């Protein structure tokens, strides 16, 4: 037994000092010897701490010069040394396994459990023994891991290979010789004797382990940690504590992909005759299973037999030997992450993995049992825990012990200076360790005792808490909740720094619309008070940064008037213009107390002051000043937006909205796509670049804002002069900032003001050359700015080009031929458009203003709601413009009457395209509105919209892609909607699902969501009492539509899984009466109930017969269903009874396999001639046509329904007539109906004698 390299193993002192060695943790990185915890025979329960590995000289000399000090080039070079040596290490160390070592040789050493080499520092002196300088494990390299070694035992004198781990002394090639141990033990952390390196009468015995084989990646590591589950039934067994008594168990989780649960990891031991032998699970190797978290082995005997937990190690009767269902030869050594069975070594009790759960009184509980019965006859594959995840998780834990140990103290007293150093260190490392870097690290915080710990400790070091938080809280919106009671702290906190700022700063951009709104009123006293006390107005500053939706404004706005008295800005500000220039000169200085001091105020007053972009009078009227000359930092463009929101809001209807525009777009050779690819999916720069190259190969006073526009054009020219200078260095965000703001704005500026007779188009021929003369690793971070300038180039080019470009050659030039010319070079429609002007006035509307909003606006519903049966006059989007202003809130008590104007549901295509951008948004405004609303227009209106949109194309009803939320309107709607029901008159709950749910008009065109989609739903009223009204019709329909389909047999059950054989009762169990109670009806909602009830068998006949569930309806249901067939002349029953003939069908054709009931055909045949139908054609159709369709069989009809053949007379009376019945004369052209009815008398005639 000779040890080797990349092979490694545990050591123990000689004479008195012998202890197992064990790393303390990440909180505690200090060496501990223990003679009490262990011996040669016992190796502790978790000896895997201080699992060490022998390595060769891991050189860090080029690093060397990198580390001591650690120009710009120097850091690339010294760094290149760094990658040469850590990566050269790779190559050396991994290739190094299996090398013989003698004594005296110089070899580094890495730690298995912490992958850390032992470090001896000859400069610093340890803290426990003053004399042996510092002993510390240092992963990066160090001068001390490297060590001359010297032979303890005299038989292994110099010059043999170590065999059998000869106790011998090793010295780092740094401090001096041997190692030495001493009576030191600590007080807070006792149990652990000392390690030292000084001149010494001690000893060190080589215990074997971790070989050149070693882990060998091929076979399950003898001691690594490993989740356990099934190919067959996952059965991942966790050992969890419940009801206050330990449970071990396996079950269902609400694991092969992504990441499993944390308590699942369990440590592996390999049966071993000695403390620390080195091996793997092998056939006959034997098997050991502990609980890492608890350090508890499994011990699995009897409930027949079932697995019970061993708490204490070294028990053979708790061992198990593998079985395993796929045997394979390459490797006689078992395969890691391979399915595998296992069973008690020690009680003839074989482990069993099954659906049965041990737990009681638990639902979907965390155990499905699987306990070791004697049996002998599953599909589990051993999985282990990842080292990335185990060092990171390990860290959150140690971190934990610190923080808990460092708060508790805090509440208690003082942290102590030496302890002071280790806690402050702790928290800056955690900022380090925090690298939105990865999912397991940030999760670690919360689940592990990183945050949990912090949260114990919250009652310098604050900096560390904050940095860990923001880094590790990119995707976690839980910390917001801290603000209700933790916010108290911030006031004290607010006095110490602006750090809470950074937190508020992450939360304003990511979170908006009612996030601590009540705090907004408070936000005034904190931005004024936070400005004045801060001096630099930290708190306020971040406050302006956030901005947000409108919610900031209404509340935030208050603060500003306060600012006027509290800001008290009275030191040096006037000129009016010239002293501004002087001031830019004094501030210009780069070194200090110049550019830096002025800058804060500058960048802040620019962005913030731009602020209120949409309201003109606050910003437009207060901002009389917007007269800046040669400004910078794009403040102005945003300011301009502010002034702009007033008026301006001109909107747009799309350029092409007739038949001619299709012909134009086609003559133009497309092009919208060429722009639209870069822009739309640009992603990285290159996608857009391609469109650049192609583009390169080409050939040649309306308002007060105009005056500013001329200077704008000139400034654009000065950018173009900037462009002639071509450079990719700095300045791209001052030029590209000014220009980014400016450029979006230029789009908007060209479209908000323009010139006709080709003066706008001329500003365009020049803009063609500005757009022609404008301006990936680092270019991602840079690439946000770059995407802003390509998108603004596209926004200019899109508002001018698309909003109104290149449209006059045809409109402006025309040929006048044949009928007295007809060139230009809805009856009295022109007169109707001044009302359109009343619409443009309604778009720009501010609230709380007397003028005429009370009664005059009234809402021109009639005029707008009356206009009907016209063509999309190219302004569908013009229409659309009107709709957008009303999205603020739909609850104002009168909107509908005005909104009633909209009505006009006659042009679904044109409008629909416009409505396409806002479908998803219309679902969210439904969700908040449609969930409850009908201040409720949005629900009624959403209903109108689903009914019109439903009969508005096929692709549109199927394109919502169901990933658009559906289960949340059926469950969310279902929880308030199952309780409440709607009955006639005017049953409200008819079109929320059903009007859409009209299967694509006659009807089903795919059932997309016909199995997984109807995963669960709301209930129909039943048991005690009785069912509901004007929900029975649409409901029975709705039942057949929740799951119906020819592809999926799942439909018949998912529409009526419950019935099977008793369905009929609920309808025979009072149908009309239900209709009666809610709306006074009865037979109306029962008869309607039977239209929709009807057509389950002959329509979507596929949602029916394909899977067999005919145990109790083939014989007992055919005579029973008849119960209640006494209707007559019922229109409501006409979609049931009169539509039965047509709409409700399927009995005789659908069942021909069993013939055990009789005499039904007679009562039916009588019923068809009593109630009637339309003249001749329907009469035959209601009774004769079901006969022609049905008639195919021939023999099956004659065997039953003795004398059932009443319908033959229909062909002489019912099937023929004059033009209709007697001589009414309704259907002019009959060759289609009679021609289709005669090719059906041939297709019908073809098979009668020998069916089909």
- DSSP one-letter string for 639-687: HHHHHHHTTT------S--SHHHHHHHHHTT--HHHHHHHHHH-TTHHH
Let me know whether 143 and 264 are in one domain.
Answer: no
Return the CATH number at 100.
Answer: 2.80.10.50
Let me know whether 683 and 776 are in one domain.
Answer: yes
Extract the tokens encoding 1118.
């055919």
The SS3 call for residue 111 is: strand
DSSP result, 950-961: HTS-SHHHHTTT
Judge whether 981 and 1026 are in contact, CB under 8 Å: no
Q: What is the dihedral of CA 117, 122, 123, 128, to 10 degrees?
A: 80
Extract the tokens encoding 17.
């000092």
Instruction: Tell me which residue of 531, 452, 416, 420 sits closest to 262, measured CA to CA.
Output: 452
| Distance, CA of 868 to CA of 905 (rounded, Å) | 8
Residue 636 lies in a domain: no
1205: Cβ–Cβ under 8 A, 6 or more apart, which residues? Answer: 1197
- In terms of Cβ atoms closer than 10 Å to its own Cβ (0-12, 13-18, 19+), residue 185 is middle
Sort residue 1154 into left (φ over 0), alpha (ψ -120 to 50) or beta: beta
Let me know whether 349 and 261 are in one domain.
Answer: yes
Let me know whether 944 and 798 are in one domain.
Answer: no
| Distance, CA of 1019 to CA of 1165 (rounded, Å) | 37
| Distance, CA of 1214 to CA of 166 (rounded, Å) | 112
Residue 570 lies in a domain: no
Residue 556 lies in a domain: no
CB atoms within 10 A of CB 851: 9
First to last CA, the chain: 85
Q: How many domains does the chain contain in total?
A: 7
Residue 504 lies in a domain: no
Q: Does residue 1089 have a cis peptide bond before it, meaning omega lies within 30 degrees of 0? A: no
Beta bridge partners of 149: 170
Instruction: Count how many Cα atoms sit within 13 Å of the Cα of residue 359 in the half-sphere of its side chain.
Output: 22
Which of 906, 930, 965 delimits the end of a domain? 965
Let me know whether 233 and 336 are in one domain.
Answer: yes
909: Cβ–Cβ under 8 A, 6 or more apart, which residues? Answer: 872, 952, 953
Let me know whether 126 and 209 are in one domain.
Answer: yes
446 marked as binding residue: yes
| Distance, CA of 400 to CA of 240 (rounded, Å) | 22
890 marked as binding residue: no
| Distance, CA of 733 to CA of 943 (rounded, Å) | 49
Judge whether 1020 and 1028 are in contact, CB under 8 Å: yes
377 marked as binding residue: no
19 marked as binding residue: no
Query: Quick one: resolution in A?
Result: 5.8
Inter-helix orientation angle 487-496/499-510, to 10°:
130
Residue 166 lies in a domain: yes
| Distance, CA of 107 to CA of 7 (rounded, Å) | 13
Backbone angles phi, psi at 344, to 5 degrees: -55, 125
251 marked as binding residue: yes
254 marked as binding residue: yes
Residue 566 lies in a domain: no
CB atoms within 10 A of CB 465: 20
Instruction: Tell me which residue of 1129, 1127, 1088, 1237 sits closest to 1176, measured CA to CA.
Output: 1237
Return the CATH number at 445.
Answer: 1.25.10.30
Instruction: Give ∠ CA 1211-1217-1221 in degrees, rounded to 5.
Output: 125
1032: Cβ–Cβ under 8 A, 6 or more apart, which residues? Answer: 1071, 1074, 1075, 1085, 1086, 1088, 1089, 1092
Q: Does residue 768 have a cis peptide bond before it, meaning omega lies within 30 degrees of 0? A: no
Judge whether 732 and 629 are in contact, CB under 8 Å: no
977: Cβ–Cβ under 8 A, 6 or more apart, which residues? Answer: 989, 1018
Backbone angles phi, psi at 85, to 5 degrees: -85, -40
Beta strand 149-150 with 169-170 is antiparallel
Residue 1210 lies in a domain: yes
Judge whether 1192 and 1247 are in contact, CB under 8 Å: yes
Residue 716 lies in a domain: yes
Let me know whether 176 and 276 are in one domain.
Answer: no
Give the chain's count of helices (H) and strands (E).
53, 22
Extract the tokens encoding 590.
């780069």
Backbone angles phi, psi at 1115, to 5 degrees: -115, -45
- Tokens 């069975």 identify what position? 341
Judge whether 335 and 381 are in contact, CB under 8 Å: no
Alpha carbon distances (Å) from 1005 to 47, 950, 1038: 66, 13, 16
Judge whether 171 and 192 are in contact, CB under 8 Å: no
Instruction: Give ∠ CA 85-89-94 in degrees, rounded to 5.
Output: 165
Q: What is the dihedral of CA 118, 121, 124, 128, to 10 degrees?
A: 40
Judge whether 431 and 502 are in contact, CB under 8 Å: no
Let me know whether 1115 and 1171 are in one domain.
Answer: no
- Tokens 């749910």 identify what position? 997
User: Which contiguous run of DSSP H or E holds residue 522?
Assistant: helix 518-534
Beta bridge partners of 287: 320
| Distance, CA of 119 to CA of 139 (rounded, Å) | 8
The SS3 call for residue 339 is: strand
Let me know whether 1019 and 927 are in one domain.
Answer: no
532 marked as binding residue: no
- Tokens 């005029």 identify what position? 863
930 marked as binding residue: yes
**Boundaries of domain holding 254:** 217-384
Extract the tokens encoding 1161.
């055909």
How many residues are listed for the chain in this entry? Answer: 1252
Judge whether 1065 and 1059 are in contact, CB under 8 Å: no
Let me know whether 689 and 679 are in one domain.
Answer: yes
Instruction: Tell me which residue of 790, 677, 684, 770 sits closest to 724, measured CA to CA.
Output: 770
Method: X-ray
Let me know whether 19 and 161 are in one domain.
Answer: yes
Which of 1153, 1168, 1196 delimits the end of a domain? 1153
Instruction: Tell me which residue of 1119, 1056, 1129, 1120 sits closest to 1087, measured CA to CA.
Output: 1129
| Distance, CA of 942 to CA of 989 (rounded, Å) | 12
Which of 214, 249, 269 delimits the end of a domain? 214
| Distance, CA of 736 to CA of 24 (rounded, Å) | 54
Inter-helix orientation angle 759-772/706-724, to 10°:
30
Instruction: Count how many Cα atoms sit within 13 Å of the Cα of residue 25 in the half-sphere of its side chain.
Output: 14
Let me know whether 1134 and 1187 are in one domain.
Answer: no
Extract the tokens encoding 1226.
């309704």
């Amino acid at each position: 037994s000779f040890l080797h390299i990349g092979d490694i193993c545990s050591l123990y002192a000689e004479g008195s000092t012998n202890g197992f060695i064990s790393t303390l943790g990440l909180v505690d990185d200090r060496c501990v010897v223990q003679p009490e915890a262990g011996d040669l025979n016992n190796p502790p329960k978790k000896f895997r701490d201080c699992l060490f590995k022998l390595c060769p000289m891991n050189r860090y000399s080029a690093q060397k010069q990198f580390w001591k000090a650690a120009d710009a080039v120097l850091l690339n070079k010294l760094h290149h040394a760094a990658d040469l040596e850590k990566k050269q290490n790779e190559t050396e160390n991994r290739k190094l396994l299996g090398t013989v070592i003698q004594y005296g040789n110089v070899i580094q050493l890495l730690h298995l459990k912490s992958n850390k080499y032992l470090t001896v520092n000859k400069r610093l002196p340890a803290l426990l023994e003053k004399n042996a300088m510092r002993v510390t494990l240092d992963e990066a390299g160090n001068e001390g891991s490297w060590f001359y070694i010297q032979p303890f035992y005299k038989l292994r004198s110099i010059g043999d290979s170590v065999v059998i781990g000869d106790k011998v002394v090793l010295n780092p090639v740094n401090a001096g010789q041997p190692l030495h141990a001493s009576s030191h033990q600590l007080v807070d952390n006792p149990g652990c004797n000392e390690v030292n390196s000084v001149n010494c009468n001690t000893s060190w015995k080589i215990v074997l382990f971790m070989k050149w084989s070693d882990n060998k990646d091929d076979i399950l590591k003898g001691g690594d940690v490993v989740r356990l589950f099934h190919a067959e039934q996952e059965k991942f067994l966790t050992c969890d504590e419940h009801r206050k008594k330990q449970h071990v168990f396996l079950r269902t989780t609400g694991s092969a992909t992504s990441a499993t649960s944390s308590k699942a990891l369990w440590e592996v031991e390999v049966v071993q005759h000695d403390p620390c032998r080195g091996g793997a699970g092998y056939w006959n190797s034997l098997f050991r299973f502990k609980h890492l978290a608890t350090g508890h082995y499994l011990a699995a005997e009897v409930d027949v037999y079932s697995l019970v937990s061993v708490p204490e190690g070294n028990d053979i009767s708790s061992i198990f030997e593998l079985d395993p269902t796929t045997l394979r030869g390459g490797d006689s050594l078992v395969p890691r992450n391979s399915y595998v069975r296992l069973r008690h070594l020690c009680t003839n009790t074989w482990v069993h993995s099954t659906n049965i759960p041990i737990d009681k009184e638990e639902e979907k509980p965390v155990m499905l049992k699987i306990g070791t019965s004697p049996l002998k006859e599953e599909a589990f594959a051993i999985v282990p825990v990842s080292p990335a995840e185990v060092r990171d998780l390990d860290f959150a834990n140690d971190a934990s012990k610190v923080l808990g140990s460092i708060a508790g103290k805090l509440e208690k007293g003082t942290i102590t200076q030496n302890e002071r150093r280790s806690v402050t260190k702790l928290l800056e490392d955690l900022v380090y360790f925090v690298t939105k870097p990865n999912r397991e690290r940030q999760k670690l915080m919360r689940e592990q005792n990183i945050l949990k710990q912090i949260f114990k400790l919250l009652q310098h070091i604050c900096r560390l808490c904050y940095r860990v938080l923001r880094h590790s809280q990119q995707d976690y919106r839980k910390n917001q909740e801290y603000i209700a009671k933790q916010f108290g702290f911030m006031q004290k906190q607010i006095g110490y720094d602006v750090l809470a700022e950074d937190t508020i700063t992450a939360l304003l951009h990511n979170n908006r619309k009612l996030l601590e709104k009540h705090i907004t009123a408070a936000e005034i006293d904190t931005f004024v008070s936070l400005v004045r006390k801060n001096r630099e107005p930290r708190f306020l500053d971040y406050l302006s940064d956030l901005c947000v939706s409108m919610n900031k404004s209404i509340p935030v706005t208050q603060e500003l008037i306060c600012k006027a008295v509290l800001n008290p800005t009275n030191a040096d500000i006037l000129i009016e213009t010239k002293l501004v220039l002087s001031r830019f000169e004094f501030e210009g200085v780069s070194t200090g107390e110049n550019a830096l001091e002025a800058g804060e105020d500058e960048e802040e007053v620019w962005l913030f002051w731009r602020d209120s972009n949409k309201e003109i009078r606050s910003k437009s009227v207060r901002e009389l000043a917007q007269d800046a000359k040669e400004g910078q930092k794009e403040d102005r463009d945003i300011l301009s937006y502010y002034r702009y929101q007033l008026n301006l809001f001109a909107r747009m209807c799309l350029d092409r909205q007739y038949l001619a525009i299709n012909e134009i777009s086609g003559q133009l050779d497309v092009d919208l796509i060429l722009r639209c690819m870069s822009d739309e999916n640009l992603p990285y720069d290159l996608r857009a670049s391609f469109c650049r190259l192609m583009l390169h190969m080409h050939v040649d006073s309306k308002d007060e804002i105009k005056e500013r526009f001329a200077q704008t054009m000139e400034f654009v020219e000065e950018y173009l002069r900037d462009v002639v200078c071509q450079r990719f260095p700095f300045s791209d965000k001052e030029k590209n900032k000014l220009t980014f703001e400016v450029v979006n704005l230029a789009r908007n500026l060209i479209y908000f003001g323009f010139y006709n007779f080709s003066d706008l188009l001329r500003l365009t021929k020049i803009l063609l050359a500005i757009l022609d003369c404008v301006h990936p690793e680092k270019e991602d971070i840079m690439v946000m700015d770059t995407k802003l300038k390509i998108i603004e180039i596209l926004q200019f080019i899109l508002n001018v080009r698309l909003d109104y470009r290149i449209s006059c050659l045809l409109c402006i030039f025309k040929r006048e031929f044949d009928e007295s010319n007809s060139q230009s070079s809805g009856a009295l429609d022109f007169e109707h458009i001044e009302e359109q002007a009343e619409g443009i006035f309604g778009g720009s509307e501010e609230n709380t203003p007397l003028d005429l909003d009370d009664h005059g606006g009234r809402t021109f519903l009639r005029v707008l709601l009356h206009l009907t049966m016209h063509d999309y006059p190219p302004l569908v989007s013009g229409a659309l413009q009107l709709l957008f202003r009303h999205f603020s809130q739909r609850q104002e008590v009168l909107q509908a009457f005005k909104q009633v104007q909209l009505l006009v549901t006659s042009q679904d295509v044109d409008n629909y395209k416009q409505i396409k951008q806002d479908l998803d948004q219309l679902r969210s405004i439904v969700e908040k509105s449609e969930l409850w609303v009908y201040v409720k227009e949005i629900l009624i209106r959403l209903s109108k919209l689903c009914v019109q949109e439903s009969a508005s194309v096929r692709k549109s009803r199927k394109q919502q892609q169901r990933l658009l939320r559906n289960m949340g309107a059926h469950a969310v709607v279902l929880e308030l909607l199952q309780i409440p029901y709607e009955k006639a008159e005017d049953t409200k709950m008819q079109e929320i699902m059903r009007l859409a749910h009209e299967f694509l008009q006659n009807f089903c065109a795919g059932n997309q969501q016909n199995q997984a989609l109807l995963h669960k739903h709301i209930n129909l009223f039943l048991n005690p009492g009785i069912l509901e009204a004007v929900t029975m019709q649409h409901i029975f329909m709705n039942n057949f539509q929740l799951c119906s389909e020819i592809n999926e047999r799942v439909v018949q059950h998912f529409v009526h899984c419950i019935e099977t054989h008793g369905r009929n009762v609920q309808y025979i169990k009072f149908l009309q009466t239900i209709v009666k109670a809610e709306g006074k009806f009865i037979k109306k909602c029962q008869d309607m109930v039977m239209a929709e009830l009807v057509n389950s068998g002959e329509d979507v006949l596929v949602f029916y017969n394909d899977r067999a569930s005919f145990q109790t309806l083939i014989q007992m249901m055919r005579s029973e269903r008849d119960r209640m067939d006494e209707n007559s002349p019922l229109m409501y029953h006409i979609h049931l009874v009169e539509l039965l003939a047509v709409c409700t069908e399927g009995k005789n054709v659908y069942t021909e396999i069993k013939c055990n009931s009789l005499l039904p055909l007679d009562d039916i045949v009588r019923v068809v001639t009593h109630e009637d139908c339309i003249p001749e054609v329907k009469i035959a159709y209601i009774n004769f046509l079901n006969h022609c369709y049905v008639d195919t069989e021939v023999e099956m009809k004659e065997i039953y329904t003795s004398n059932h053949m009443w319908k033959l007379f229909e062909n002489f009376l019912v099937d023929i007539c004059r033009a209709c019945n007697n001589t009414s004369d309704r259907k002019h052209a009959d060759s289609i109906l009679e021609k289709y009815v005669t090719e059906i008398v041939m297709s019908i005639v073809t098979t009668f004698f020998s069916s089909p």
